[PDB]
Specification:
It is found in: Host cytoplasm; Host nucleus. The protein is built from 7 helices and 5 strands. By secondary structure, the chain is of the alpha+beta class. It has one domain. It binds the ligand O=C(O)c1[nH]c(Br)cc(=O)c1O and manganese (II) ion (2 copies).
Length: about 180
């Protein structure tokens, strides 16, 4: 276990339940794919944090089931004209009027940024990558959030990494490229 216990102790029950739903839909067991379990939990929490740091600025798309997520995306596109994205993004920014793809990587932020940008192939989806070392990379170096919110996200990620390290789980996670 170990990784399972750490996930249950460091993430709130709602996030853990959402991640378990994601993995049960993928056909993957969270007791076997422990690293993917933790990665999904971390990504969900970063998305929720990003959103909470907003007159209601961000619409959360991640964390919903596919049907609801695409319903939300379609409503946004129909009421703003913003082009519908090819792949499901993570948030929508009502202030900048643009979708946001959030990335959390155990590798260098620029490697994962290139990977995500090559993947999404949509010039209009904004991309924000965070690492577990306090580094970030965003489209056009536009980081959207203010310094304090980004710092809180960075601190949470670093703290997750250090919690894993104290439990001897960081090495496997970092090499597990489940992201
Ligand atoms: O939306 C998704 O399904 C998704 N999948 C991976 Br893999 C990494 C992400 O950041 C993300 O948002
Ligand atoms: Mn997503
Ligand atoms: Mn994402």
């Amino acid at each position: 276990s170990a990784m399972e216990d750490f996930v249950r102790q460091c993430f709130n029950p709602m996030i853990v339940e959402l991640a378990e739903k994601a993995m049960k839909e993928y056909g993957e067991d969270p007791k076997i794919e422990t690293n993917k379990f933790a990665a999904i939990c971390t990504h969900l929490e970063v998305c929720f944090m990003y959103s909470d740091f907003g007159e209601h600025r961000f619409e959360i798309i991640e964390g919903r089931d596919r049907i609801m997520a695409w319903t939300v995306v379609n409503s946004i596109c129909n009421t703003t004209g913003v082009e519908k994205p090819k792949f499901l993004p993570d948030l929508y920014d009502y202030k900048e009027n643009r979708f946001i793809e959030i990335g959390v990587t155990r590798r260098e932020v620029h490697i994962y940024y290139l990977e995500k940008a090559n993947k999404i192939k949509s010039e209009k989806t904004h991309i924000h990558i965070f690492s577990f070392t306090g580094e970030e990379m965003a489209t056009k170096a536009d980081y959207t959030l203010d310094e304090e919110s980004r710092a809180r996200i960075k601190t949470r990620l670093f703290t997750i990494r250090q919690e894993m390290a104290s439990r001897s789980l960081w090495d496997s996670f970092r090499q597990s490229e489940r992201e």
